[PDB]
Amino acid sequence: GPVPSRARVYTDVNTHRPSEYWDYESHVVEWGNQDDYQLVRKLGRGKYSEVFEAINITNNEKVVVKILKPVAAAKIKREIKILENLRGGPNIITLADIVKDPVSRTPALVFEHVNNTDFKQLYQTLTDYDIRFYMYEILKALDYCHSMGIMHRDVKPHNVMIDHEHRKLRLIDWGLAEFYHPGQEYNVRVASRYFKGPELLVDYQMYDYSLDMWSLGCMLASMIFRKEPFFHGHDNYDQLVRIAKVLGTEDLYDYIDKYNIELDPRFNDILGRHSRKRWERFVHSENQHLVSPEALDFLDKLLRYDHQSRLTAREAMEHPYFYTVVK
Ligand SMILES: Nc1ncnc2c1ncn2[C@@H]1O[C@H](COP(=O)(O)OP(=O)(O)OP(=O)(O)O)[C@@H](O)[C@H]1O
Ligand SMILES: Cc1ccc(O)c(-c2ccc(C[NH3+])cc2Cl)c1
Known part of the structure; x- marks a missing residue:
């Protein structure tokens, strides 16, 4: 072989x-509040998500919201754990928050714009x-x-x-x-x-x-x-x-x-x-x-x-x- x-x-x-x-399966997601974010415009729709430009109304800063399309739970926890492990690393996108989107009922990843x-x-x-x-x-x-x-x-x-x-x-x-x-x-x-x-x-x-x-x-x-x-x-x-x-x-x-x-x-x-x-x-x-x-x-x-x-x-x-x- x-x-x-x-x-x-x-x-x-x-x-x-x-x-x-x-061990991303055992990771417990600390949920943010979806109400902190106001969707402005759709930036794109990929195979795995819908991406939006948004405003964090707690500090009026521009953010990006990636609303995950329903996919195997394992795939979603893996992305979250990796983003959290890498957060603050050189030229790595910063995951600012994780919220439950009220419409899709799926996790929405909030990133720096x-x-x-x-x-x-x-x-x-x-x-x-x-x-x-x-x-x-x-x-x-x-x-x-x-x-x-x-x-x-x-x-x-x-x-x-x-x-x-x-x-x-x-x-x-x-x-x-x-x-x-x-x-x-x-x-x-x-x-x-x-x-x-x-x-x-x-x-x-x-x-x-x-x-x-x-x-x-x-x-x-x-x-x-x-x-x-x-x-x-x-x-x-x-x-x-x-x-x-x-x-x-x-x-x-x-x-x-x-x-x-x-x-x-x-x-x-x-x-x-x-x-x-x-x-x-x-x-x-x-x-x-x-x-x-x-x-x-x-x-x-x-x-x-x-x-x-x-x-x-x-x-x-x-x-x-x-x-x-x-x-
Ligand atoms: N932090 C960000 N700031 C600005 N734009 C972003 C950011 N994150 C994502 N985008 C926009 O959203 C697009 C797709 O994001 P991402 O690749 O994570 O989603 P996807 O489900 O893989 O979609 P696709 O199938 O188009 O790749 C990017 O190509 C980019 O144009
Ligand atoms: C330095 C380098 C080499 C090859 C490339 O295509 C790029 C590049 C990276 C991201 C974008 C925008 N999405 C565009 C380009 Cl050209 C950069």
Whole structure:
């Protein structure tokens, strides 16, 4: 069967913290008063919730209310416990309160409001310097949650709030986040298609924090190369083929060989044979202002098949790509 895997970092965090820290099922929610909040406008409606701009009428401050759609009780307590454990961490969204919505009869998560700059505007206008600056802010959030025994599992632009005016970044939507327990087999149906790590695409369930680093690499590649999304799969199978056309099939076969994974037989007909492409191949006159040897070397170290061989968030912060960033 598949060979087991453990993270190379923060393996023992949930072991040396008390059971109350990670045992989200046993957590007793301290309910706030829904009357403290007045809904202003609907901001969005996702697959798991309806999001509203609101006012905390006790201090007249702008807040965001995430009214959870009815889903398994376990999923809701896990998000709450993770948000509470991470509260106050660098660039982590602050959960201000938890109330019972009077209409839905479900929990409503109250968060600090972030004046998020338009995604299009950020994608099209962030400079080489700003990309490095914001990547460093994301790494602060990832190293914090990983050091706290949590993996996000849904790192992507939609889950990163940027208030560009105040150079403020927040990592949001901890709805897919999980506690990392060495040897635990996790559901591979996490992250959005273009951000899925090769471990998820090959159905390797013993993954860890390093999945977030692959997702981060996907975000970076699209941004610096002006190729949205960087790995543009038509489905989860073609998603692996898109990766293989850049990283090559030989290192993919080495990866599956090392972990004793058996590829789904449907790959035999679609994967073909591909050599690794040098990162300089993706450079052209419309993206050369966002690329540098440091950017390419950094990307190279995140987008690796072997989840164990990727830079951790802390090593990533030491990379020459960030030397120019004012600290
Ligand atoms: N703290 C916040 N400040 C400002 N806007 C927010 C905040 N939190 C969430 N939003 C807005 O709500 C959107 C969705 O939030 P979230 O992803 O947590 O809900 P979801 O159920 O996953 O919805 P979706 O399916 O759209 O992702 C975000 O993309 C963002 O635009
Ligand atoms: C530094 C960096 C790199 C790649 C990205 O897509 C982003 C980014 C993050 C969040 C949003 C807004 N939701 C937009 C962008 Cl471009 C940032």
